[PDB]
Amino acid sequence: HDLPEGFEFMEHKVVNKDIHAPHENLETLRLTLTRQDEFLLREEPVKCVTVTGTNGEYGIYPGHAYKIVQLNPSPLTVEYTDGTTKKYFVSGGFAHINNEGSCDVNTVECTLLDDLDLAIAEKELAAQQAALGSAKDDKAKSVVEIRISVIEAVIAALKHH
Amino acid sequence: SSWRDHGISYLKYLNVCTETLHSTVKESRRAKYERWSKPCYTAQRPDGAGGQETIDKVPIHTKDY
Amino acid sequence: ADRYQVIFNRFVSAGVQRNAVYNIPSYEKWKEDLADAASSDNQKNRYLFAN
Amino acid sequence: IALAGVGLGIGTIFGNLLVACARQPNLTKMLFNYAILGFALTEAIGLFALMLAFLMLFS
């Protein structure tokens, strides 16, 4: 009695390029932006994608080398070959960049920057700041500071444009 | 940053961030996103005497992390 | 733990619900396999991912 | 003294060679050939300096 593995029912596998192979000139990056097991974008050709990982900002274009990036709460930019821009905001996750010309950005939450409200973002920071002053212990203060970092990133993200 | 030193795991870090991000969303759109960050889970073992005993090994609310 | 295994139901269609299994090996065994997939020719498809 | 910048340059090549072989274990053959190529090119400079030294030493 052998059971199927849950990945057998998934028909869109990841294609890796053999290292001993000729290079190709690619003008499109196939992006897959995903939230909580839901793709907002699927193998969607985009000219470029800008992502904020722990070390800093990465601008991924077609042909980018194989890399894994641990994202931080921050904006994410997706620019199509039309030159049109779509800006999301992510709270965390990972970005897998493949040398074959694909980028699978899996996030816990990915919301268009339009949906976020700056007025709500500002008042929320003030509330958490008061708690951080009265936060009982070190652990509570650390959690509160996590919220503030995300809020300030959101506030700064919206003030940018 | 400083949460790692306190034993907080990465998964708990993400849950806090997601709740905060959903907090900033417009009130009109908050309903959709907030249904994805509302704890509704518990851990229970059937007791000996036809009862249910909750298990406090993992926190459920971001406040108690 | 040697492995954490999740046994759930996959919804193939409205009338087909099979049983599926996600097996997650713990850190020690996973990093060991990840180390072999990187160095060795074995597990070619995982060579680039592991490195 | 010119050899100081030659021997060091060779060490630089091999130092990077080990790192490359570590992060691409299944490409060791091409890297080794290129490393040898770089060594020979640097060795050419070393011989040029050596030839001048011999000329000014035996004449």
Side-chain angles (χ1 to χ4, degrees):
Chain A
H1 175 269
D2 297 333
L3 282 183
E5 207 179 23
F7 309 105
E8 304 180 15
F9 314 89
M10 324 192 90
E11 293 179 353
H12 307 100
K13 310 281 193 165
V14 197
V15 164
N16 303 18
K17 202 169 185 168
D18 55 329
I19 64 181
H20 314 104
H23 181 63
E24 176 175 1
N25 303 336
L26 308 157
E27 279 285 3
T28 59
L29 177 81
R30 313 202 303 276
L31 186 77
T32 308
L33 182 62
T34 299
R35 70 179 286 284
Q36 299 214 6
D37 198 325
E38 142 178 10
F39 60 78
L40 306 89
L41 311 158
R42 159 184 173 174
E43 311 302 60
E44 162 53 17
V46 299
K47 174 189 61 46
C48 86
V49 56
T50 313
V51 298
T52 293
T54 302
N55 301 18
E57 298 187 8
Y58 307 78
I60 317 165
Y61 283 54
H64 192 294
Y66 208 121
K67 184 166 179 55
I68 293 164
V69 182
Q70 178 179 358
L71 314 183
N72 286 26
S74 289
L76 185 163
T77 310
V78 183
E79 211 168 24
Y80 308 91
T81 63
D82 308 356
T84 64
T85 315
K86 197 165 294 168
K87 290 179 288 180
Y88 303 92
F89 197 97
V90 314
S91 59
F94 279 64
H96 317 68
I97 314 173
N98 192 324
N99 61 349
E100 189 268 4
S102 60
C103 180
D104 303 8
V105 179
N106 303 336
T107 59
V108 189
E109 175 58 40
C110 170
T111 184
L112 284 164
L113 203 66
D114 180 12
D115 292 325
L116 309 192
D117 191 335
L118 180 49
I120 304 302
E122 293 237 338
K123 65 181 202 187
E124 190 57 73
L125 167 46
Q128 302 303 314
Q129 260 165 17
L132 186 49
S134 79
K136 170 200 165 193
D137 224 323
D138 309 67
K139 258 198 199 169
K141 297 159 187 181
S142 64
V143 179
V144 179
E145 291 170 21
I146 292 166
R147 294 199 163 83
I148 292 165
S149 48
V150 180
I151 293 158
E152 272 197 332
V154 177
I155 295 167
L158 290 157
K159 288 184 176 181
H160 179 277
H161 181 249
Chain B
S1 294
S2 182
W3 54 269
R4 309 194 73 95
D5 299 356
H6 298 150
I8 296 175
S9 59
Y10 182 57
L11 308 182
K12 296 179 174 180
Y13 164 83
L14 292 170
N15 297 341
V16 176
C17 289
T18 56
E19 154 59 348
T20 300
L21 179 48
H22 294 179
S23 192
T24 64
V25 178
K26 288 159 183 169
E27 301 177 33
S28 168
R29 283 95 140 181
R30 183 185 289 191
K32 175 192 154 158
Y33 291 113
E34 183 163 303
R35 293 212 318 116
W36 296 92
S37 69
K38 257 173 174 161
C40 282
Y41 36 93
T42 62
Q44 308 185 342
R45 155 170 70 261
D47 215 334
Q52 283 286 17
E53 162 179 49
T54 55
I55 307 295
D56 54 322
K57 291 172 186 179
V58 183
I60 289 72
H61 280 81
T62 56
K63 72 180 184 164
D64 285 355
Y65 281 167
Chain C
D2 184 312
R3 84 194 184 178
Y4 313 85
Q5 188 193 40
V6 197
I7 321 203
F8 73 102
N9 294 93
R10 176 78 179 194
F11 173 87
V12 183
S13 62
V16 184
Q17 298 75 45
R18 284 209 283 172
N19 285 340
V21 144
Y22 286 138
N23 228 330
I24 312 158
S26 59
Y27 204 58
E28 306 198 31
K29 283 192 171 295
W30 178 62
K31 261 175 73 179
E32 291 166 15
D33 191 8
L34 197 67
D36 174 294
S39 59
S40 304
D41 60 355
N42 299 264
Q43 320 182 39
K44 186 290 206 174
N45 200 34
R46 303 220 305 162
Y47 165 89
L48 284 176
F49 170 86
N51 285 287
Chain D
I1 295 177
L3 303 180
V6 174
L8 176 58
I10 291 167
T12 298
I13 292 174
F14 279 63
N16 292 265
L17 168 58
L18 310 189
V19 177
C21 297
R23 63 183 63 191
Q24 278 297 336
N26 276 308
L27 199 61
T28 296
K29 198 178 195 181
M30 295 182 178
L31 302 175
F32 184 80
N33 298 336
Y34 295 172
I36 292 298
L37 181 66
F39 155 79
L41 298 173
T42 58
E43 196 70 2
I45 289 298
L47 296 181
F48 276 108
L50 210 75
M51 184 173 61
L52 296 181
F54 287 137
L55 288 174
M56 289 191 299
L57 176 55
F58 290 107
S59 296

